[PDB]
Design an enzyme around this catalytic site. Structure first.
Site, short mmCIF file in Angstrom:
data_model
loop_
_atom_site.label_atom_id
_atom_site.label_comp_id
_atom_site.label_asym_id
_atom_site.label_seq_id
_atom_site.Cartn_x
_atom_site.Cartn_y
_atom_site.Cartn_z
N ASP A 524 36.50 45.51 39.91
CA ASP A 524 36.91 44.85 41.17
C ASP A 524 36.17 45.56 42.31
O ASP A 524 34.98 45.31 42.44
CB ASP A 524 38.44 44.77 41.24
CG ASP A 524 39.00 43.90 40.14
OD1 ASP A 524 38.23 43.07 39.57
OD2 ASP A 524 40.18 44.04 39.85
N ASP A 531 44.85 37.47 44.48
CA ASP A 531 45.20 37.73 43.07
C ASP A 531 46.17 36.63 42.65
O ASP A 531 46.38 35.66 43.40
CB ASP A 531 45.71 39.16 42.90
CG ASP A 531 45.35 39.76 41.55
OD1 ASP A 531 45.89 39.23 40.52
OD2 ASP A 531 44.50 40.71 41.52
C1 LIG Z 1 45.40 38.59 37.16
C2 LIG Z 1 44.67 39.90 37.23
O1 LIG Z 1 44.08 40.37 36.26
N1 LIG Z 1 44.72 40.52 38.41
C3 LIG Z 1 44.18 41.88 38.53
C4 LIG Z 1 45.26 42.86 39.03
O2 LIG Z 1 45.99 43.25 37.84
C5 LIG Z 1 47.34 42.79 37.88
O3 LIG Z 1 48.10 43.49 38.90
C6 LIG Z 1 49.50 43.25 38.86
C7 LIG Z 1 49.98 44.08 40.02
O4 LIG Z 1 51.35 43.74 40.34
C8 LIG Z 1 50.10 43.62 37.52
O5 LIG Z 1 49.82 44.99 37.25
C9 LIG Z 1 49.45 42.78 36.42
O6 LIG Z 1 50.00 43.14 35.15
C10 LIG Z 1 47.92 42.93 36.44
O7 LIG Z 1 47.22 41.99 35.57
C11 LIG Z 1 44.65 44.11 39.64
O8 LIG Z 1 45.63 45.07 40.04
C12 LIG Z 1 43.81 43.68 40.84
C13 LIG Z 1 43.20 44.84 41.66
O9 LIG Z 1 42.20 45.44 40.85
O10 LIG Z 1 42.79 42.83 40.39
C14 LIG Z 1 42.84 41.91 39.28
O11 LIG Z 1 41.75 42.29 38.37
#
Ligand SMILES: CC(=O)N[C@@H]1[C@@H](O[C@@H]2O[C@H](CO)[C@H](O)[C@H](O)[C@H]2O)[C@H](O)[C@@H](CO)O[C@H]1O
Ligand code: NA
Length: 619
Positions: A524, A531
């Site tokens: 990222d 998101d």
């Molecule tokens: C859908 C996805 O992969 N989004 C990523 C984020 O990962 C998610 O973050 C939430 C936070 O509440 C949960 O941890 C979930 O289980 C994760 O899939 C990630 O935090 C952000 C920032 O790097 O980007 C996306 O890659």
């Protein structure tokens, strides 16, 4: 270190970063900055929370309804007001020191005074790649190609060359002593101006006694005494400036009322009172059910300097907090190093918690677990645990909660996180009906005027909130630990990624008037991230030199995204990351990119988007 400050402004002068690199020059730029933000920024969210907190969702609706670029001219000629609306002396010094470093990183001149600027050859950058493979793996362990990180390596090598010049000038120690003597006077003057900007309990680490009644004349001595007080609506607890509370912590379970809130603050003269928790302030976190991914840690002991456990109608203000580890047996990147917080907020057994406010906290060196995303782990983290008996006390969640004016430095894992909930599995659709938030989600969440810098993971994240407003925040240098060098033992947790300032499973979030610089490379490492969530709008945000680019639209549950009236200046990697997203309306933005930095970021380019009426300059 004052010799390093002196050296930085010597380089700033030779780069022409600032016209006047004297200590008075620093003072006038600080005064100018604060006066400009006060004259030019929006007024909403300045001053007492009682005058605006109920109107957050209403102001979000108004701003989302805007039909043209507000103050387009200022934005396009580089005089728009964004980022924190007030910079403390500490915020401002760190911001400028980062500005000088980034100016060196992008400098094209032959010399900086007598220093010949190194020209990094292909051989030299390729050698750095081959020697630092642990910095170039992505979420699933796949390497970025050399071509994808070439310009990021050159930036890093120029930052190291910059850093070597600082220690060199430091080594070479006349007018340095003059410059530093004057800087100390200016610094004290600035601290004097900063400082100018029921029962009352006084606590003094220096003059108090826990047997006292806690009057200003006979103050308490320790936070343990505070932890035992039966605080009532209208009570104040004031910590004496100059106080250091060594290995202490505030763990509170107290409720004011709307009419008579509880206040925790400072009194007297000197430095903010310091809560130096040093890995103590132990408590047991348990969400009571698995989170959105089964691999997320959801129970265990946490160390928190300030724990607000089912508190309401409470404001905490004007404190300095650290939470360092380093206990016997502990290594920094250990897989199950204790989760640590500066301020942990918990909702569990009181249904909706109302009117919790953090204001002007300086939170640094919170050495939480490098990996764990949803334990109360980082500088500020508010979460919601399964109630003992939800049928009796209601869904645990937040209403009318603000985080304002806080300075975070060297917190891991998170910067500021507000809202992760044990109800997370109720939101596992793309579209999120308002009813999900009526039952399980947060209302009137306001995060503004914070500075987050040198953060292990994500800068600022709002979670499970209806129309949160995240605005007038400044972020530098987040995701520092989102790479294999620090993220050594993730086990089955994955999560080696971070972005700057963004919403998770929010409805109609508004992120506006933020500033994000120098995100540290990972899969990222963009400034902005629509998101998973429904209706996210970014408008009037400034991004610069983020190593993963400007904005991501993340996978199939990132729905109804719009990105308009933003300015991106020399973001790297690739500007937009539409990664498997179903839509993204990307329009009426201004981007400045190198010809060799693509508009669409490689491997993050297979989503659906409409990009139209954007102004893309080459630099
Ligand atoms: C859908 C996805 O992969 N989004 C990523 C984020 O990962 C998610 O973050 C939430 C936070 O509440 C949960 O941890 C979930 O289980 C994760 O899939 C990630 O935090 C952000 C920032 O790097 O980007 C996306 O890659
Ligand atoms: Na309640």
């Amino acid at each position: 270190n004052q010799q390093e400050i002196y050296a930085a402004y010597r380089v700033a002068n030779l780069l022409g970063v600032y016209e006047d690199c004297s200590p008075n020059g620093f003072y006038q730029r600080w005064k100018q900055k604060n006066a400009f933000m006060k004259a030019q920024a929006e007024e909403f969210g300045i001053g007492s929370t009682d005058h605006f907190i109920d109107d957050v969702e209403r102001i979000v609706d108004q701003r989302r309804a805007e039909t043209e670029w507000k103050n387009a001219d200022a934005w396009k000629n580089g005089t728009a007001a964004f980022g924190a609306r007030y910079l403390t002396p500490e915020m401002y010094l760190d911001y400028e020191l980062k500005s000088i470093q980034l100016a060196f990183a992008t400098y094209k001149g032959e010399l900086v005074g007598n220093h010949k600027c190194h020209v990094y050859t292909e051989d030299e950058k390729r050698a750095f790649y081959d020697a630092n493979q642990d910095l170039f793996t992505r979420y699933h362990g796949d390497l970025f190609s050399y071509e994808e990180v070439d310009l990021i390596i050159e930036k890093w090598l120029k930052v190291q060359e910059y850093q070597d010049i600082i220690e060199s000038v430091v080594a070479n120690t006349d007018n340095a002593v003059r410059w530093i003597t004057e800087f100390e006077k200016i610094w004290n003057q600035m601290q004097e101006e900063k400082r100018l900007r029921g029962h009352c309990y006084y606590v003094s680490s220096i003059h108090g006694d826990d047997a006292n009644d806690g009057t200003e004349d006979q103050p308490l001595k320790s936070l343990y005494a505070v932890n035992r007080l039966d605080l009532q609506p209208g009570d104040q607890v004031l910590l004496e400036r100059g106080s250091v509370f060594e290995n202490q912590f505030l763990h509170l379970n107290v409720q004011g009322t709307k009419e008579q809130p509880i206040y925790i603050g400072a009194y007297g003269n000197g430095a903010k009172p310091l809560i130096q928790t040093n890995g103590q302030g132990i408590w047991y976190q348990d969400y009571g059910n698995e989170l959105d991914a089964p691999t997320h840690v959801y129970r265990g002991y946490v160390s928190s300097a300030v724990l607000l456990y089912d508190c309401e109608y409470l404001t905490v203000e004007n404190l300095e907090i650290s939470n360092k580890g380093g206990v016997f047996g502990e290594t920094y990147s250990a897989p199950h190093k204790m989760n640590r917080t500066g301020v942990a907020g918990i909702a569990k057994n009181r249904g909706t918690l109302h009117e919790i406010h953090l204001s002007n906290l300086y939170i640094h060196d919170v050495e939480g677990n490098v990996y764990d995303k949803h334990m109360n782990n980082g500088g500020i983290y508010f979460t919601c645990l399964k109630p003992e008996a939800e049928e009796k006390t209601g869904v645990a969640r937040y209403e009318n909660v603000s985080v304002r004016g806080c300075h975070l430095k060297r917190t891991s894992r998170w910067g500021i996180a507000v809202g992760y909930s044990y109800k997370c599995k109720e939101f596992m659709t793309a579209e999120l009906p308002d009813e999900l938030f009526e039952r399980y989600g947060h209302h009137n969440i306001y995060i503004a005027d914070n500075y987050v810098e040198e953060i292990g993971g994500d800068g600022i994240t709002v979670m499970y909130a209806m129309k949160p407003l995240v605005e007038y925040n400044s972020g530098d240098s987040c995701a520092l630990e989102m790479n294999d060098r620090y993220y050594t033992e993730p086990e089955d947790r994955a999560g080696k990624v971070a972005a700057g300032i963004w919403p998770w499973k929010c409805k109609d979030a508004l992120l506006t008037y933020n500033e994000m610089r120098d995100m540290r490379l990972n899969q990222d490492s963009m400034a902005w991230d629509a998101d998973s969530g429904d209706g996210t709008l970014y408008q009037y945000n400034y991004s610069h030199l983020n190593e993963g680019g400007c904005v991501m639209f993340c996978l199939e549950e990132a729905i109804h995204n719009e990105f308009r009236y933003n300015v991106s200046v020399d973001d790297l990697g690739g500007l937009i990351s539409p990664s498997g997203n179903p839509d993204a309306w990307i329009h009426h933005n201004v981007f400045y990119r190198r010809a060799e930095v693509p508009f669409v970021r490689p491997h993050m380019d297979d989503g659906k988007y409409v990009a139209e009426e954007n102004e893309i300059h080459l630099i």
